[PDB]
Amino acid sequence: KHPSGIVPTLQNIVSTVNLDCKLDLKAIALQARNAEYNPKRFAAVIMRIREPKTTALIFASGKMVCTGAKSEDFSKMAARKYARIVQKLGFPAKFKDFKIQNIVGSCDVKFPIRLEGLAYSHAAFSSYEPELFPGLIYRMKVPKIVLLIFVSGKIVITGAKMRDETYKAFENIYPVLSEFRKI
DNA sequence: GCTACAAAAGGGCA
DNA sequence: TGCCCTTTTGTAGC
């Protein structure tokens, strides 16, 4: 499962669910204290809960985005809790088509990387402009995943909709990272 | 408290 | 149109 002997830690999960009902945002924004709303700035009511620590963007259309959870299950859990809060408020809220939209992971290979060398050998995948951003942007094709590689050996993997995509991207990159270990 | 990246949802505006 | 808007999170040099 994990040949490199390293398991990326899941850091942020983004999901969406359909409450399947139109919502009155100003009413929700008035009844709730755990809520914010400035339509002039953004179309959603921003709401937050402590456990699991997350932030939901709630729309009039009944759709909802959930951010900040550390796992897929935590994300679904937080979404149901927001859905329960909306119900207590007077809306016939359901929970339709809950879907994990993005998973962000990170790990430490515990060795320095020669980013310049890596980018040169993988030009068709690499974006390295150190004066702009200190990390090398690696757009992997299979799985379709974006990895941010730093000189420190710190790696961020984002864009996954399944956690096995996150693990594979990392196992795919590990041998390349070793090839460009900074001695 | 910006550079960079992924992703969703919506109003607004070239 | 599509591209911002907003939110989250890791990373790191400015």
Side-chain angles (χ1 to χ4, degrees), chain A residues 1-39 41-183:
Chain A
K1 215 309 183 62
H2 301 282
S4 68
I6 296 168
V7 189
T9 298
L10 297 191
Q11 304 284 6
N12 177 38
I13 304 273
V14 173
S15 66
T16 51
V17 71
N18 191 348
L19 299 194
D20 210 40
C21 77
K22 297 315 166 193
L23 304 174
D24 181 337
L25 308 187
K26 202 52 258 183
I28 301 171
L30 302 177
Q31 287 180 259
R33 233 60 186 136
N34 259 24
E36 309 186 316
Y37 182 50
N38 185 359
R41 190 147 176 261
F42 189 60
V45 156
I46 281 65
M47 195 174 283
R48 301 179 167 96
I49 61 178
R50 277 184 80 190
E51 295 299 347
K53 178 166 172 254
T54 57
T55 294
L57 309 179
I58 293 163
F59 303 85
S61 61
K63 291 184 172 185
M64 178 178 78
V65 173
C66 181
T67 62
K70 296 288 175 180
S71 75
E72 300 89 324
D73 286 358
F74 277 145
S75 192
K76 185 170 206 172
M77 175 189 312
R80 284 182 97 227
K81 298 192 182 223
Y82 286 113
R84 197 181 182 241
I85 296 174
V86 172
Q87 288 167 349
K88 307 298 206 65
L89 257 32
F91 304 88
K94 306 304 156 246
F95 206 71
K96 186 190 180 191
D97 308 305
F98 170 87
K99 175 171 169 46
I100 294 292
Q101 300 289 2
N102 183 45
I103 301 165
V104 179
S106 74
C107 43
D108 190 354
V109 298
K110 317 293 203 301
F111 62 74
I113 319 287
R114 288 193 297 114
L115 298 184
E116 203 189 297
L118 174 11
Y120 192 40
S121 35
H122 292 75
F125 310 104
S126 306
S127 278
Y128 186 42
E129 285 202 26
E131 281 164 339
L132 311 200
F133 183 72
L136 181 160
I137 311 304
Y138 198 104
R139 290 181 169 88
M140 190 172 282
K141 281 323 170 206
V142 187
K144 197 184 195 289
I145 291 298
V146 176
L147 302 93
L148 311 188
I149 305 162
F150 303 83
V151 196
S152 51
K154 262 35 186 285
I155 312 303
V156 171
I157 313 94
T158 189
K161 276 185 197 293
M162 284 309 152
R163 73 165 63 181
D164 280 356
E165 294 179 303
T166 306
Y167 298 151
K168 193 73 200 95
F170 181 73
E171 292 299 317
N172 278 359
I173 211 67
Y174 194 73
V176 183
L177 301 181
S178 304
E179 184 180 9
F180 294 100
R181 176 169 61 91
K182 186 170 179 294
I183 307 174

